[PDB]
């Protein structure tokens with residue numbers, strides 16, 4: 001059975017990362033802020049909060065709005081997630097040294113939770129007011145959920161596949177999983193992968209809050225997201241998009257790229273339990289972690305760090321604690337970055353994969369914010385208080401999306 | 415290098431198929447109708463055509479509407495594509511003999527072009543009229559594009575992954591590709607895969623017709639879809655959904671399932687050329703065909719049949735003719751089923767994959783309708799007139815989606 005450890009799969013490395021978050025548009029500045037204990041989560045100042053008297057009045061908008069970088073033309077020819085994708089794609093490529101790769105060995109895999117959905121409403125309104133010829137010839141390419149990945153593949157010249165997985169909260173991690181597959185099956189040597197997602201607005205808040213999925217701790221916004229804490233009361237939105245460049249180790253060495261980490265394996269399973277609730281027993285989610293280890297060639301004792309899905313819902317954190325135990329990883333140092341960055345749905349698995357890479361690169365886990373009275377029924381080694389510097393050799397990033405989609409990514413220190 | 419032919423990949427077989435089309439709700443009846451020269455494409459009788467005086471007044475609605483099978487509860491708890499998925503999922507499982515499989519070795523991969531998008535508008539309207547608490551607690555799970563795959567995975571108990579690829583016209587074929595990967599990489603032994611898509615409506619017609627992508631031959635609706643014909647003028651919508659059951663040959667043999675065909679390999683490439691136009695040179699699309707042959711262990715001389723993407727746009731059919739030549743497959747007998755069934759976007763690649771299976775099973779290709787004055791600039795062996803009975807050993811199904819997504823699936827006779 002092939003594994004990364006035994007050479008059955010080629011070695012794959014992470015050579016560049018980019019992200020925009022509620023803390024910073026610069027991933028290295030986001031990382032510094034996380035280590036400093038900063039939160040991106042604040043009182044929402046948008047008019048729509050008071051217009052609807054929303055129960056949720058907190059969240060993290062991007063520190064640097066995407067459209068502050070978008071001129072008239074981009075504002076008219078692309079949906080929001082496409083604009084975010086174009087922005088991050090160009091940033092990532094610059095960070096990688098603008099390499100000249102073989103387009104025929106270059107893939108793009110970018111997940112997203114929904115797609116260009118605001119352009120559906122706009123086209124709907126345009127046609128209602130002016131008839132069918134008032135719909136733009138660009139409407140289809142803006143609306144289609146593959147649109148962000150297509151924009152990035154066209155921008156950077158990727159001709160070895162342009163793929164868009166949709167799996168709610170696990171979309172951005174699943175994209176990295178499929179990019180890894182595209183390389184280890186031999187279809188590509190280099191891939192841009194990750195996830196993008198739209199911004200906080202009234203209808204997204206209404207839809208998730210009517211599930212009772214969201215925190216309503218509006219008086220202390222930075223204290224609201226409390227993964228694994230006894231007093232947690234749901235997730236907080238925190239906007240993001242994130243991409244990484246992965247490539248075979250031989251490809252990286254041949255162009256002088258310095259790896260940040262190794263991407264060793266990916267496990268994809270499903271709960272088949274409930275359309276939005278995770279399975280309480282954590283068994284299939286744990287199996288995704290185990291599968292990523294099988295493909296990497298690691299045992300659970302090797303896993304020093306888990307970057308938790310950790311949304312801070314009551315049932316989600318409990319299920320994940322069971323999952324981590326099921327996978328034999330409950331001695332790992334656990335970080336729940338949604339404590340600081342919130343939940344960005346189709347982007348968040350990619351963002352947390354980038355954070356996992358940085359933890360391995362720098363030998364440090366930032367503190368899980370708001371972990372103050374640990375839930376008596378969960379017993380994980382949650383990093384908290386201040387960053388924990390440690391000898392982290394291998395890590396798993398978890399993302400368990402609504403719908404029952406479990407993705408685990410196994411990374412190693414380079 | 416592993417191939418199906420040399421044993422590096424396990425043998426994978428197709429053991430059950432289901433589809434709903436503009437000709438019939440019964441795939442075997444659809445097949446009989448195609449062989450009889452029937453078209454599913456008629457004058458649209460919907461009020462929305464006259465309300466907007468749409469330039470396109472033709473298309474194929476499902477012969478048997480999905481919602482004629484949906485009671486009050488399903489109409490309130492699922493989006494349209496989810497209702498179609500539940501319908502086809504249960505039909506497929508019954509056709510397969512309702513097997514008892516290991517949930518932990520059972521995956522679902524279902525592509526779609528857009529998702530539960532009508533529920534976005536509905537939630538939008540509900541909140542505008544009644545505030546945030548009038549949005550349903552079910553809105554998120556109905557809207558999310560992974561929703562149809564999630565419904566099917568929950569219905570049938572698939573715990574080895576539930577995935578949703580989005581790649582416009584190639585979504586349903588890409589789903590079958592990823593299911594094949596999930597099996598040959600060892601993550602699953604059996605998978606339900608295919609694609610679902612929404613119905614014809616005024617806004618979809620307006621959006622694609624403003625690209626000049628659609629036929630306007632309204633006076634002779636069954637004559638409008640003319641792939642590879644000199645007089646073609648764009649595609650016609652024809653509603654569909656389709657699923658197939660695939661599994662390792664050893665799994666099929668162990669439960670007494672009789673294979674309909676072998677699924678031998680899958681190639682995924684991309685054009686990185688234009689957001690909606692295919693590359694004229696057909697090179698990357700041809701490479702998807704070549705890649706499917708490499709993974710199968712076939713040479714182009716083995717390919718007896720190509721089930722063309724064949725949408726009947728001027729530029730699409732020309733590009734595909736170049737693609738087929740680039741791949742060395744231009745001596746294959748070509749069928750363009752959109753001539754009879756129209757284009758169903760995220761479902762159509764799955765539907766045409768089912769048709770490819772039936773061609774191999776039965777040794778017959780139905781006639782490409784409306785192929786009467788072949789385009790002088792395209793020289794393919796298009797089957798036409800009446801069905802061609804022939805010794806078809808291997809076939810490739812092509813799907814080249816808007817965005818530049820190329821998927822080719824290589825199938826073999828069992």
Ligand SMILES: CCCCS(=O)(=O)Nc1ccc2[nH]c(C#N)c(C)c2c1
Pocket residue numbers: 080081113114115116117118197198199200201204237238239240343344345346
């Ligand atoms: C972190 C927040 C997640 C919100 S989301 O999950 O609802 N996704 C999502 C996707 C595309 C979107 N386009 C637009 C516009 N205009 C919005 C508001 C928008 C929202």
Ligand SMILES: CCCCS(=O)(=O)Nc1ccc2[nH]c(C#N)c(C)c2c1
Pocket residue numbers: 494495527528529530531532611612613614615618651652653654757758759760
């Ligand atoms: C063969 C036709 C393809 C049309 S589509 O590509 O526009 N897709 C698509 C997807 C979901 C949809 N939900 C609803 C509703 N109500 C519609 C009209 C609808 C349409």
Ligand code: NA
Pocket residue numbers: 307308309310352353397398399
């Ligand atoms: Na994580």
Ligand code: NA
Pocket residue numbers: 721722723724766767811812813
């Ligand atoms: Na086809």
